[PDB]
Homo-oligomer: A and B are copies of this chain.
Amino acid sequence: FASVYAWNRKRISNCVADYSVLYNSASFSTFKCYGVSPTKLNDLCFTNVYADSFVIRGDEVRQIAPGQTGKIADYNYKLPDDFTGCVIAWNSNNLDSKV
């Protein structure tokens, strides 16, 4: 992954996106969608999807939300107040930690 101050950005189009394989998985602690109901994600067709990836501390997942204030929100990654989309967050203590 990449650090938060240089969060990785990718654009996806011209594809068939299956969201069932993401919802059924028992690995994601936080799966919170804002614009639409997640269970209906297979029912909509889009284009120009944006994917941002990075790594943060445990306490800072709460700051990834529209209209949020803190340190990461106002210095590393700011969300539009009218954001539409979804946020996924899970634990990586196994791979991103070292004694």
Contact = CB atoms under 8 A, between A and B. Distances in A.
Give the number of times this chain occurs in the complex, counting copies: 2
A42 interface: no
A28 B91 contact: no
A94 interface: yes
Contact of A93 (B26, B94, B98, B99): B94
Give the contact-size bracket for chain A.
10 to 19
Contacts of A26: 98-99
A29 interface: yes
Contacts of A91: 93-94
A28 B93 contact: no
A27 B93 contact: no
